[PDB]
Every structure is written in structure tokens, then in C-alpha cells.
Amino acid sequence: QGMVTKIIWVSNNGKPNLKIEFVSEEEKSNFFKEVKKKASELGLNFPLVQGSGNSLLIEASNYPINPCGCYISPGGKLAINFGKVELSHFILPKVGVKTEHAEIFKDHNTIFFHKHKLPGVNSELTFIPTGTPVIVDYLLSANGSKAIDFVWSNFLKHPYNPKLKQPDANVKAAWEKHADWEHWSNMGQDWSLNTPSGLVPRPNHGIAHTLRVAQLVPVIAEFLKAYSGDPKFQKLTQKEIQKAQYMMLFSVIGRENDMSWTDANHYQQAFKEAYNGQYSKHIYATFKENAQKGFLNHVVTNKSSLIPSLFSDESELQYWAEALDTGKPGISSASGILMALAHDLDLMRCYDKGKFNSLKMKDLVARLGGNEDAAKKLADYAHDLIVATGDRCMGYGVTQDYNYSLFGKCSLDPNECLKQLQSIPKPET
């Protein structure tokens, strides 16, 4: 259960109090009943007083007669004494207060709200956003799970488009005139992979890649908080990280082959040189359209589940719908960089060591304040995820080809793939 909507650091009289909002009026009338009863069974006088509307107030402490209540710590943090550790374990889960919100010591009756979570008076902390419906690691959540099932069954389980396996005869002729261009056979590379479990489509951009990059996002975020030195990452909320993680599930669903951006540029120009300068839609533009169509499809179906639980509102959802692109969203924002780094890190599966080190590792190190040790620890984790899913690795660490048996089991079963990814311990900062 949740019960509590939000809590506020208020100041009735000179003493610091805590205003507790609730969903329903009866919910307040039950929180009041259960706690006051629990407090009287511990011989405690817990100052739980009815407030305005559906709110309850925890009055200040009354030393030495009644130490229970609120007070301001010497460090400035808001503290609440529950008298006994028994009462705290009975109240905190009903409110939603965890280690993320306050300092909760083992075998102790007093908690301390973090200074950056609840700085001073009139500071708020929402547990349940107003408008939250009653539905009848974020990858484990209901929203995450439904998104995984969607991108798998609607896009990632399907073969690449044979029409985009190679250009027509005309475009081929215009292509081969450029010696500086890689051959047009790049359009058909990494088409599929034979495994004992079955023929795996798009093996370089499948469910394994998708789940891996999504898995990397919260880990990279923590490293950025610790080693980047940039305030924008230090202020990055868990909510934002969840959205960034959620969006990476749709990162490559639009792809119709394993083309590079450069290959696509070459196709467009060769199309131009072959058909009297006629315009053709850039293939990566088609990819985006495909991904947007899929994303918007899933969104409108589960709009109630996503707003406001994950996305603030319909307009914020519009932002991501427009920003959605293949691989990276190419935005210079905090979230943008985070998602791009997760994408870049997984490129060790298809880049050679020289290419991956120079083009990707040097970037990551710079992002991490120049900390090479931190970068290695992060890259090692990405390497472990690739090994755990039987994928190939050619850009970092102990290089390997596909573990065909393991890769087949994971790539043809998102649930199994997700299970293997979770078997890998996350590195600490």
C-alpha cells in the first residue's frame, strides 16, 4: 500500500512540523487510527494531530517529557523521533520514506531527512503524483515489462527488410564510382545469425542489445554523479533516469537493416546521381518514422499507466516522442548525454579495439572527469553484460565471438535475456 500523497516541512508556531497529505479522507482516518493505536501499545505519546483537509501533522518534540516528534538537527536537517524503533518500522513504509529520502539508522528511533531532499520550510516531497490511477530497476516495473513485450513482439523479433538488403541496379552503379565509400554490401551485413535455438534476426540490434543498453543507463548515471564533477548529473533525479532507461527500449525498433549513418548518406547521394537528381528520403529518417509510429502506438494504449507515473504530462511525453531517434536522441542535455553514453558503451560488440578505444573510450573518460579507473570499471560491466547474453565482443576486454547457444536462448526470449543481465553484479562508486 501507499496511502500518503506527499509530505511538507511546515512551521506552525516556532516549532518545525511535518504535514502529511493523503489520497482519501478515509485513508487519513485509518492512518490516524492504526498509528495512534500502535503508539499507545508501546507506551508512546506520538504527537499525531489532525490538520487542514485530509492532512495530518507531526508536531515537534517535547523534551524531556515527550521526545517523540520533529526537531531540527544541528546540521540543519529535519529530524523525527519516533520514540521506539518499533514505531518507526510501522510508520515509514506507510508514508514511503526510504533511504533515498532520509537517514535511517539500524536499530534507532530517529530519522534525518536529507538536506537536498528537504532543505527547509515549505519544502515538499511527493510520493504519489496527483492524478495517479489505480491500475487493474525500472525494467522490472509493469511499465517497463509491457514496453519490453511491445518492442519485442512488434519490432525486434522480426527480420530486417529484404528491400533494404541492397540498392537497385541503378543506385549500385552510382555507388561503385566512389572509391572512398565502403561497398554497398554494408546494407546486408549482420542480417541474421544461426543458433541452436533458431535463426536470430538483426543480431547486432536485437532484444539483447536493447535490454543491455537500457540496463546500462542507471549504472552510468551513478558514475556520472560521482566522477563527472558536473552539477547537471549530480542533480539528476531517479525519475529522469527511469525515463531515459524507458526510452532506450525504443532505441532501435525503427531499423530495417544494419546500415551505418554514413552508408545511408551514400545511398541518398547515389540515388541522386542515378535518377537525374531526384530526392529520396534519408533511410535514417525512415527509421525515426518507424520508431515514432511504434512508440506512439504503445503510448496511447497505456497513456493512463505512463502519466503521471513516469511522464509528467502529455506535453513532456510529446518531447520524447519528437526527440526519439535511432540509437541516440542527439540532445546536449543531461539525459541526452546519459542515453548516448549507454549506446556508445555497447558498441564494443561491433567495433574493433582501436576504433572503440579512440572513438568511444576517450569520450567516456572525458565525461568521467578523466578518471580512467572509473571508465574501466564501467566498461568492464558492459563487457560482463555482453558475455552474460552470449553476444560477441571485439572492442574491449576479453574479446570473443558469439556464444551461439547462449546468444540464441537470450535473443529469442526477452525474459531469459533480462534474467541473465540481472545475474551480473553492478559496480560501485
Contact between 111 and 58 under an 8 Å Cβ cutoff? The reply is no
- All three cell numbers of 195: 543458433
Scanning the structure block, which residue is given the C-alpha cell 529535519? 78
Residue in 411, 418, 414 with CA at minimum distance from that of residue 385: 418
Distances in Å between the Cα of 191 and the Cα atoms of 57, 161, 204 are 63, 9, 8
**Structural contact between residues 402 and 193, judged by C-beta atoms closer than 8 angstroms:** yes
* Cell numbers linked to 297: 502506438
Strand order in the sheet with 110-113: 69-72, 78-81, 110-113, 102-104
Q: Which of these, 283, 276, 256, 286, lies nearest to 170 by C-alpha position?
A: 276
Fold (CATH) for 4-126: Gyrase A; domain 2 (3.30.1360)
Q: Reduced to 3 states, what is the DSSP secondary structure of residue 250?
A: helix
Sole residue written with cell 549513418? 261
Type of residue at 74: P
* Neighbour tally for 376: CB within 10 Å: 17
Beta strands in 26-68 (DSSP E): 48-50, 56-58
Residue ranges per structural domain of the chain: 4-126, 138-421
Whole-angstrom CA distances from 35 to 30, 41, 44, 48, 87 are: 8, 10, 11, 8, 8
Contact predicate 343/328, CB 8 Å:
yes
Task: Show the cell assigned to 131.
Answer: 492524478
Got the DSSP string for 93-126? HHHT--TTTEEE-TT-SEEEE-TTTS-STTEEEE
Give me the sign of the Cα torsion angle 336, 338, 339, 343.
Answer: positive
Q: How far apart are CA 131 and CA 280, in angstroms?
A: 45
Buried b (16+ CB within 10 A) or exposed e, 136-152: eebbebebbeebbebbb
Give the determination technique: X-ray
C-alpha cell at 40: 499507545
User: Is residue 215 within 8 Å of 201, Cβ to Cβ?
Assistant: no
* Lookup result for grid cell 565502403: 182
Q: Which of 345, 422, 427, 350 is CA-nearest to residue 382?
A: 345
